[PDB]
Amino acid sequence: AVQISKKRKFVSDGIFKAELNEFLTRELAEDGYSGVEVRVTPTRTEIIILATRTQNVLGEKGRRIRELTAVVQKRFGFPEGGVELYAEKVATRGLCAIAQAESLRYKLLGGLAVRRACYGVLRFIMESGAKGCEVVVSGKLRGQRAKSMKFVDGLMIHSGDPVNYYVDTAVRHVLLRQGVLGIKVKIMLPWDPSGKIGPKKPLPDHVSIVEPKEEVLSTTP
Amino acid sequence: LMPKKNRIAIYELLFKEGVMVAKKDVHLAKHPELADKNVPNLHVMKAMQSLKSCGYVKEQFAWRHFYWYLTNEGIQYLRDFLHLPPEIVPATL
Amino acid sequence: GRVRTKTVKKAARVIIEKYYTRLGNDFHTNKRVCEEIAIIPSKKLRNKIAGYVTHLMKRIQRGPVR
RNA sequence: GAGCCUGCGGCUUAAUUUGACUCAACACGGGGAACCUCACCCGGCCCGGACAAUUGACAGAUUCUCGAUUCUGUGGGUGGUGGUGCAUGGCCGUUCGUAGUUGGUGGAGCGAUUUGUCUGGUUGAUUCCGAUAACGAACGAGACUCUGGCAUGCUAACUAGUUACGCGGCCGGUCGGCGUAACUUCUUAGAGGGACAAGUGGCGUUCAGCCACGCGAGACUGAGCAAUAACAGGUCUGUGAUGCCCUUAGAUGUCCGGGGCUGCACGCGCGCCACAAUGGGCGGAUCAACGUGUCCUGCGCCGACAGGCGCGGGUAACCCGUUGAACCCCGCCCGUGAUGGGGACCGAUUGAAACUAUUUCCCGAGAACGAGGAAUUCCCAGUAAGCGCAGGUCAUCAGCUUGCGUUGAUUAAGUCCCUGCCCUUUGUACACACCGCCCGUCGCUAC
Structure with a gap:
């Protein structure tokens, strides 16, 4: 065949992961889309979809799930039956940045209030368990002049390597009839020593020491 | 001119x-996808453009491509135009 | 820039009050105690802690630290 | 300063291709300008056309033919390099990476608020120590992350190699090429070590640390991520990021060969030697590294060079490739000289197409510039610089830039002197906050 080189194979894979990500964030953003995970296996390409509500994505007898399976097989060139799509429901969506970023975006597009919707998600982030979150909305807020109001509560790490696996940042655009607004959501993941809830690796500044376990001094043999 | x-x-x-x-x-x-005929790309994007303006198909986009989905209303419009009985059903539905 | 931060200052003091007989005046032996006792995801940080404990042990044997 | 290469004013006037003009404008827009596509400029084929009649057209700068659900069958469907970055988002620069912010409880004040968040020492650092009506913590800083310096210790290598003795020439020694025996110094990458002010001396609230010596691969450095925030500092010309407005079928999407690569002097940054003498030349000789490669290029015919032809490897630790890089090293020539210094200005290749030279080569061609006005940029260790390579841009190209290796210093292990910068005190009629506020005369109108 074309004999795809490895330097161009990983790129062609990462673009398929990126283009499928953007296509679903513009199509499944209503059902609570959170991402996809791919597993390149010959004759069986399992492409799982992570959403908050999967009962509505299915349909009466799996109507919408058949379309997306027939959607990527025709745009990326997958054979008939050679691609299989699965839908999974995630938990504790308050830790997912893009889940909470699209959540308040669908409520800010109505002009109801920018302080009620922001405080509405701040409680769910803390209720689901988090070490701090961030909500930033910029643009012509409450006037023609551009105004930015930052909503901070808890803790937040900005520098270092742990910012990759301890805090996830999401950016979304707001389409209003008066202008354009931005949405910055920064959720901090709780340290889970197991690995099921969030990150397993602790912070570098987590020197916390175990107790000596009441070391007793012997008196006589 | 189509x-x-x-x-x-x-x-x-x-x-x-x-x-x-x-x-x-x-x-x-x-x-x-239309290889057996010489249908240009204009006859695919403009002929489908009339379906969206009339509310017969839903479109999606990833930077270069259209992702069209026949709505329940649009399939009813094509059931009489294509001259097919009401008993058959598409593969997606 | 040989000044330790609060992460090294506090850890080196709480490790002595809980383990005083364990640590001596050798940095290399004190370095191995912190591996089994404390949990640190960095190796350069452990050498700074055990290195400052060695400096404190010379002061402890000299007198009561403040 | 000299010639020149590009960038932006200024000029030019089909239009000189627009934004951005102190730091934070001027090889910027990853924009090194033939077409593209280019927004500019002017000519035109054109419904390759629609939410509620022919497209043609040998005849020409009009004669007639055929297709047979898309023709102003009669007020909105939409396109965007058209405006507004003093309407915006997203990103980014800058303040400034200078180290600065926040909560609870307690204390002070009627209160806004304050204390914590500090006289001093130390530290690049709100880094510690110390002090203390504060106590205890968080963000930043640090830690962390990828790099590099060593590990003859380990894990493994016919897609990496050496080392042992045998067929290749010379004088078995001495040097090369060709084959699967042991394991890994050399190569690659995995795991795990090693370096913490640890040791000594000196100076220190004998705290925080600092300095000199040892031992030692280093007493150690180069990236990245980078706070409370602010600016009206850029981006509408990076987007199916977007609101609105203008322009919307004689068109503010194209496109055709293209026009847009434009000069009387001033400006930046950058390459190139001069003022051969430490240089040019010629012939030796001899050493890199990242990175890319469906295009990179290896061999054979033949041009002097630039090219051309067939045969091949490589989608790669497999081929280019042991990347035979330049400077440099060695021999000769040149010599009180605008000289052999200076390289300005006057056949091939890429593509559909180079005229206003795309580049390349050949011969000819030989200007200014004698170490450079007042000023001004950068830098202290494998650093500056010298030298050359590779990537990005790319059909054709690097005087650019991002990397890379190469040769390798001078000086300094400092100071508020100067110019930029935060903190404290202080003052304020300032608070969309000095780009602030505000006074009087004059001038206009009304009472």
Whole structure:
């Protein structure tokens, strides 16, 4: 065949992961889309979809799930039956940045209030368990002049390597009839020593020491 | 300026599977999925454009491509135009 | 820039009050105690802690630290 | 300063291709300008056309033919390099990476608020120590992350190699090429070590640390991520990021060969030697490294060079490739000289197409510039610089830039002197906050 080189194979894979990500964030953003995970296996390409509500994505007898399976097989060139799509429901969506970023975006597009919707998600982030979150909305807020109001509560790490696996940042655009607004959501993941809830690796500044376990001094043999 | 014979090949293919994918390029010679005919890319993006303006298909986009999905109303519009009985059902539905 | 931060200052003091007989005046032996006792995801940080404990042990044997 | 290469004013006037003009404008827009596509400029084929009649057209700068659900069958469907970055988002620069912010409880004040968040020492650092009506913590800083310096210790290598003795020439020694025996110094990458002010001396609230010596691969450095925030500092010309407005079928999407690569002097940054003498030349000789490669290029015919032809490897630790890089090293020539210094200005290749030279080569061609006005940029260790390579841009190209290796210093292990910068005190009629506020005369109108 074309004999795809490895330097161009990983790129062609990462673009398929990126283009499928953007296509679903513009199509499944209503059902609570959170991402996809791919597993390149010959004759069986399992492409799982992570959403908050999967009962509505299915349909009466799996109507919408058949379309997306027939959607990527025709745009990326997958054979008939050679691609299989699965839908999974995630938990504790308050830790997912893009889940909470699209959540308040669908409520800010109505002009109801920018302080009620922001405080509405701040409680769910803390209720689901988090070490701090961030909500930033910029643009012509409450006037023609551009105004930015930052909503901070808890803790937040900005520098270092742990910012990759301890805090996830999401950016979304707001389409209003008066202008354009931005949405910055920064959720901090709780340290889970197991690995099921969030990150397993602790912070570098987590020197916390175990107790000596009441070391007793012997008196006589 | 769109012929009729190509209109059946674009709508019946969209009927057997309710998905139609086309690339946004007004200078493409032939559509990849429409290979048995010489249907240009204009006859795929403009003939489907009339379905969205009339509310017959839902479109999605990833930077170059259309992702069309026959709505429940649009399939009813194509059930009489393609001259098929009300008993058959597409593959997506 | 040989000044330790609060992460090294506090850890080196709480490790002595809980383990005083364990640590001596050798940095290399004190370095191995912190591996089994404390949990640190960095190796350069452990050498700074055990290095400052060695400096404190010379002061402890000299007198009561403040 | 000299010639020149590009960038932006200024000029030019089909239009000189637009934004951005102190730091934070001027090889910027990853924009090194033939077409593209280019927004500019002017000519035109054109419904390759629609939500509620022919497309043609040998005849020409009009004669007639055919297709047979898309023709102003009669007020909105939409396109965007058209405006507004003093309407915006997203990103980014800058303040400034200078180290600065926040909560609870307690204390002070009627209160806004304050204390914590500090006289001093130390530290690049709100880094510690110390002090203390505060106590205890958080963000930043640090830690962390990828790099590099060593590990003859380990894990493994016919897609990496050496080392042992045998067929290749010379004088078995001495040097090369060709084959699967042991394991890994050399190569690659995995795991795990090693370096913490640890040791000594000196100076220190003998705290925080600092300095000199040892031992030692280093007493150690180069990236990245980078706070409370602010600016009206850029981006509408990076987007199916977007609101609105203008323009919307004689068109503010194209496109055709293209026009847009434009000069009387001033400006930046950058390459190139001069003022051969430490240089040019010629012939030796001899050493890199990242990175890329469906295009990179290896061999054979033949041009002097630039090219051309067939045969091949490589989608790669497999081929280019042991990347035979330049400077440099060695021999000769040149010599009180605008000289052999200076390289300005006057056949091939890429593509559909180079005229206003795309580049390349050949011969000819030989200007200014004698170490450079007042000023001004950068830098202290494998650093500056010298030298050359590779990537990005790319059909054709690097005087650019991002990397890379190469040769390798001078000086300094400092100071508020100067110019930029935060903190404290202080003052304020300032608070969309000095780009602030505000006074009087004059001038206009009304009472």
